[PDB]
């Protein structure tokens, strides 16, 4: 499942 810290600017909210 996608890494939320791969790009912190992407907030999965």
């Amino acid at each position, epitope marked *: *499942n*996608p*890494d939320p*810290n*791969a*790009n*912190p*600017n*992407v*907030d*999965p*909210n």
Partner: antibody, heavy 121, light 114 residues
């Protein structure tokens, strides 16, 4: 207007280091993370690492971990990136960027104008 | 590590015609929870920083012309320019933000055909 201006070009010899600045403005600097992406001449974009503006947490690419160092100066709202042990193959335009800032509401994406780093003897 | 392969390396299509850039990811970059592909399409003209055209594969960044189209899901993606202008002559990069390291495609050189 959110602007990322970054330092002028640098010419270094192999084995030297370079520190490339990224001054942020037009937004609240401690909120978002600045990424560092380099692009060799005629080559694809290569992501190097990011740092959170207020926290200072870093994540490096595995290709550069041992030479790269991204830092924060909340006082100056500026991001720095230090690539050590330079190599001719590090000759590239180095970008700092607020990559794909996707917040619940509006989305935006902003890059610095480019720092041409030339590594040669 | 997630390899982004773009096809073709270079296409030449005439003014007002259709341009299709293909992009394939080494790994499926679709999150089933939020139903979103973690893909990004960038446009870069010579000597300038890249410009985000599409995020979430299809969601269009504010200010991008409606002739640009982002499509695809999972591993196969497509950037479509319905009627090419001379302003669209650039290198187009697909970009995944699904896992680290963030990777970009090799780029696709779009040129005017005459």
């Amino acid at each position: 207007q959110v602007h990322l201006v970054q330092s002028g070009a640098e010419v270094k010899k192999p084995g030297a280091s370079v520190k490339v600045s990224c001054k942020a403005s037009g937004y609240t600097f401690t909120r978002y993370a600045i990424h560092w992406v380099r692009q060799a001449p005629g080559q694809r974009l290569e992501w190097m690492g990011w740092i959170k503006g207020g926290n200072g947490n870093t994540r490096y690419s595995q290709k550069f971990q041992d030479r790269v160092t991204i830092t924060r100066d909340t006082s100056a709202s500026t991001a720095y990136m230090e690539l050590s042990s330079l190599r001719s193959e590090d000759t590239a335009v180095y970008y700092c960027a607020l990559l794909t800032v996707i917040t619940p509401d509006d989305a935006f994406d902003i890059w610095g104008q480019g720092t041409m780093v030339t590594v040669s003897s | 590590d997630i390899v982004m392969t773009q096809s073709p390396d270079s296409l030449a299509v005439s003014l007002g015609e259709r341009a299709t850039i293909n992009c394939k990811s080494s790994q499926n970059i679709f999150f089933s929870s939020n139903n979103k592909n973690y893909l990004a399409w960038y446009q870069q003209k010579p000597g300038q920083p890249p410009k985000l055209l599409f995020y979430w594969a299809s969601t269009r960044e504010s200010g991008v012309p409606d002739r640009f189209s982002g499509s695809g899901s999972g591993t196969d993606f497509t950037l479509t320019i319905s009627s090419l202008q001379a302003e669209d002559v650039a290198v187009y990069y697909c970009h995944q933000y699904y896992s680290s390291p963030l990777t970009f495609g090799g780029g696709t050189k779009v040129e005017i055909k005459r």
